[PDB]
Amino acid sequence: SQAIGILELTSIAKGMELGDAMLKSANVDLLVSKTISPGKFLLMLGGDIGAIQQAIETGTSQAGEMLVDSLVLANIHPSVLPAISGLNSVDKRQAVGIVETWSVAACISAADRAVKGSNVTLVRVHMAFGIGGKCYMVVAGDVSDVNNAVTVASESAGEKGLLVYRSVIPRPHEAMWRQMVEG
Amino acid sequence: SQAIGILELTSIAKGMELGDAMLKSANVDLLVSKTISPGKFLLMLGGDIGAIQQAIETGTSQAGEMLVDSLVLANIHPSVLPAISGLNSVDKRQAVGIVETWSVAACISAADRAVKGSNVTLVRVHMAFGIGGKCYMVVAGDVSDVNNAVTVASESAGEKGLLVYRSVIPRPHEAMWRQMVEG
Amino acid sequence: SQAIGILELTSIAKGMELGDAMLKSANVDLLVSKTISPGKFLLMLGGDIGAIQQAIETGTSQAGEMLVDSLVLANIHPSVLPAISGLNSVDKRQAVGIVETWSVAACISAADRAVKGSNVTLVRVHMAFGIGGKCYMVVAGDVSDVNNAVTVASESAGEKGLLVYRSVIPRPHEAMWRQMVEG
Ligand SMILES: [Cl-]
Ligand SMILES: [Cl-]
Ligand SMILES: [Cl-]
Ligand code: NA
Ligand code: NA
Ligand code: NA
Question: Which parts of the sequence belong to the BMC domain (chains A, B, C)?
Fold first, then answer.
């Protein structure tokens, strides 16, 4: 019911300019606004699909030759948005699931399918290094629920050859727990 | 009326040693002291030109084959120094200006010219990744003042082919403001 | 009397899974658990040698083709462990010593020899960028003690061609001290 918009620029100044322009252009939330090596800039927005399409249209329209890439992912479960900008609260501890993908697009699509095909909580979506790099989702819930979520997410990414690894970790060790659910 | 000294080493231990040596050698402020990938070390100093020349002389004199590069930038407006080490306080909000350059030297020279050719506040000078990488200056003030500052800075960097992008952003959006003026 | 175990994986999810598995497998402390560019994962453990051998055995046994590298360093002075995970308290200020190496293995072995061949405090062991990159140890104590420690450490690393630089810094400047002993 929500949408994610991604805009990547070769200029950090243009990135900040376009972040400003897009936020003014439509009712959208800023999820990510950061510099990526070597010196590119990444913006990710969340909001209604109409708003996101117009925001990304505005951004692409004004990027010129500084435009690197852009994407709109429609019909994304609402919990995915705060999982990109930060952390969702864990309401169950029994198990953690982690699915690692190439690309944040594959990760987002897999996380969406996971949440929609199970009763797990999507805790966070992490990008190790920009939108083309290793990304991973972390889910939490009952072991059976986590297994379902991880399977669905893995199938999503794997169909594309973009699954790196999947892991179901019941009863995570106390010394790993914080890193898993908070980073 | 002030000067900036830059010393880059291939050794982190030598960098810390030379930071110590230079600070003892003259009355200078440490502005930056950090490791840069792959494993080099960056020192930037501020102070009177005489002190900075002797500090950088000392540093270069003792660097040996670990010396990567060194520079002294003379007659730099005093506000540029704290803009490199941290943030200057914003006394006006009406507009933000951002000028992105290749190299911190070009950024410093452009920021100096901007401050000297306008009434803007130089808020900060940011290096994304070491002294040769993308850098940018952020200024704040009245829209007309910011436009002047950005034009002057852009001309400085552009004459060298080192201007990446320039942006005048009146009335920055609330969700971009903090990143612009604080990073 | 203690041991350090190192496990490196090509998968971040596998890394977190293996961190969990190894911690459950034996009585070991997690010293490091982090992602390294481009997208690998690094685990370092401390504990009794028996526990560490079994933990690393477990980790290697389950890593499969995601295994990048693994190492067990036996008979490491106990102070080296907290120097890897964080900071040891400085009980003397007179001098700082810094020895920079290629590889954390060389750094650990050099730090161990330094501590065992002197009365210095090992303050910290730092990895700039993963286990193969620039690393350095920082020691503190009386100038004579620091000189001994640095010489011993330098000989250790230098015999292998893995010494980058060694530095004895009596009476470190106030503006460098915190970075030296805390990072
Ligand atoms: Cl559940
Ligand atoms: Cl102004
Ligand atoms: Cl001592
Ligand atoms: Na649990
Ligand atoms: Na404003
Ligand atoms: Na001292």
Answer: 3-85, 95-181
